[PDB]
Design a protein around this ligand. Sequence first.
Ligand SMILES: COc1cc([C@@H](CC(=O)O)c2ccc(C)c(CN(C)S(=O)(=O)c3ccccc3)c2)cc2nnn(C)c12
Ligand SMILES: [Cl-]
Length: 289
Amino acid sequence: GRLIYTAGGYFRQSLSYLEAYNPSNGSWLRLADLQVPRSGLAGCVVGGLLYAVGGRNNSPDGNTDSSALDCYNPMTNQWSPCASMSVPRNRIGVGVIDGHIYAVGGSHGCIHHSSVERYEPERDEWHLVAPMLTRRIGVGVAVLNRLLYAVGGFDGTNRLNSAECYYPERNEWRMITPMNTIRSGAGVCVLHNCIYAAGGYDGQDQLNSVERYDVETETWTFVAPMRHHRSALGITVHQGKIYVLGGYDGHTFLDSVECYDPDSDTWSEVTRMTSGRSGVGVAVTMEPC
Ligand SMILES: COc1cc([C@@H](CC(=O)O)c2ccc(C)c(CN(C)S(=O)(=O)c3ccccc3)c2)cc2nnn(C)c12
Ligand SMILES: [Cl-]
């Protein structure tokens, strides 16, 4: 089976948890803690390693933004440090193209990054690429058809409905059609030919709305809203279904996990995380050991 891994997050302070959910049987496993607690990080998978990227350690003893890339091997249930990024990136978004990891945006203190860098596992090296046209933290990132999309976020002044696309062979960013909704800290992922943006914060409210961008039509369309309003949710795709994990609804750090069936256009509660949290990193890979 493949599992949905949730790494880090926030409740009262930044968390070190790594836990893995099995959609086939409803079970959660607690696995090895992150070496450093972090919220506002991103997860991704390349070649059966799980990567935790960026974030911030919000702790009683200080707040430290992370430039870390940490490598988890499910076969050994151990974390190893991999090469650090050029800069700390809190409230980061990540995407994988052709075995390479793109780290997009995020903050370092009051610095809101437009910069983007790319990691090569074979060399354990990061290299900067062209920066986005817009500074974005709490940025949603997805990959469709080997193109990288940066969606919404916060530019240091305004939360954003704008989005843009990176063309690797041109090393160039271009704006796409903006969303219908301003969203910072949305969950962004890809399913079929569409980029989904679920939830987020608009500077006033946490959102339950969900909309999707069809690369062929260049339009955003709303689908059914989630059962819960959520900002700083985790999101992933497992077998043609979107799963959203946790986040903040204006009142509670949610343990709710919901999944979306695109054929019925419905959201269903699927499970609860072992404890409520937001700002997690999420990805899917093989079950450990
Ligand atoms: C300033 O108020 C908020 C800003 C954000 C945005 C940033 C912005 O638009 O300014 C944002 C986006 C992405 C992440 C991962 C986070 C951090 N996370 C919530 S977190 O879970 O990592 C976290 C939790 C509490 C304290 C620190 C960390 C924030 C979302 C909010 N939703 N409600 N409000 C009241 C929000
Ligand atoms: Cl933060």
